[model samples]
Target chain A: WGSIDQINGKLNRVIEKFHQIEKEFSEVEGRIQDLEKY
Target chain B: WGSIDQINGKLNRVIEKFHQIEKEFSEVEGRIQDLEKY
Candidate 1:
């Protein structure tokens, strides 16, 4: 729903990119943690 | 987009955990379908 949110402003793009990074990191961390548990 | 048919597979934990993916997918799909011109 927010795919165009990138064109909002510099601040919005920065925040969105930060959030994307955080999400990617979290996903990787979770996967690694699961692998460790296996 | 997922029907949640299998909850015992290796993909379950990830899929179930990140359920927002399916919801996002559905929302995007619905939005796209709505964009169709009749």
Candidate 2:
């Protein structure tokens, strides 16, 4: 089992990736909405 | 500061939400692709 610090670090990295994915998801949603307006 | 278990639980919840978001994101992406093909 990893130490608490190790797990914390891993969680931090995952959170960072999640933020990026969420940002991209938002942009894609906006793009689709714009397309639908046509 | 939260204990290790508390932090771990929080991370788990975040991960669960992330999975749901990712699933929706995939569906939206597919919808956009279908729209683009028209």
Candidate 3:
């Protein structure tokens, strides 16, 4: 598994991937709404 | 920090990792539920 893979980054470096996912989802929602509007 | 690269794939895309985390948490939660369930 990638879990046991490289891990070159710091252990607890703490990136904002959660927020990225949130934003990406929001974009998805917007795309959905735009499609619905069509 | 870990924000750099090569987790082999940890939070890079957050694929099945959280499900595993959620599953692990479920075990822990199950234990908690056992205490509370008691």
Candidate 4:
């Protein structure tokens, strides 16, 4: 019940990082698939 | 050698993501600590 805004701010930051990481992982998977095509 | 260099390049990209995620985790841990102090 204390400093909820502060905790939410930190959680938001962590979520953004996870989203970025997920996007990067998807990109890397595409690269791997492209390599297998040759 | 079947494009070992290409595979290595993709791996390097993925490793970078891990490093970024690690940094974010550290930041989150610090935030958690700050909250606990209150």
Instruction: Name the best candidate (by TM-score).
Output: 2
Best by DockQ: 2
Residue A6 displacement in candidate 1 (angstroms): 12
Clashing pairs in model 1, backbone N/Cα/C closer than 3 A: none
Q: What is the C-alpha lDDT profile of model 3 across B1-38, one tens digit per residue?
A: 36435453455456467546656744654654465445
> What TM-score does structure 1 among the candidates reach?
0.37
Candidate 3 chain A minimal-lDDT segment of 10 residues: A5-14
CAPRI category for model 3? incorrect
Question: Which tens-of-lDDT digit does each residue in A1-38 have in candidate 3?
Answer: 45433353333333454455557557656655655575
Specify the CAPRI tier of model 4.
incorrect
All models: lDDT?
0.51, 0.82, 0.52, 0.61
Off by over 4 Å in 4: B1-38
CA displacement after TM-score superposition, residue A21 of candidate 4 (Å)? 0.8
* Residue B6 error, candidate 1, Å: 54
Give DockQ for candidates 1 onward, in order.
0.02, 0.50, 0.08, 0.02
Ranking by lDDT: 2, 4, 3, 1
Instruction: Provide the lDDT at B33 for model 4.
Output: 49
| Best of the two (2, 3) by lDDT | 2
TM-score of chain B of 1: 0.46
- CAPRI-wise, candidate 1 is incorrect
Interface RMSD of structure candidate 1 (Å):
23.9
Model 2, residue A35: C-alpha shift (Å): 0.9
Worst 10 residues of 4 chain B by lDDT: B1-10
Which candidate, 1 or 3, would have the higher lDDT against the true structure?
3
Model 3 TM-score (B-chain only): 0.48
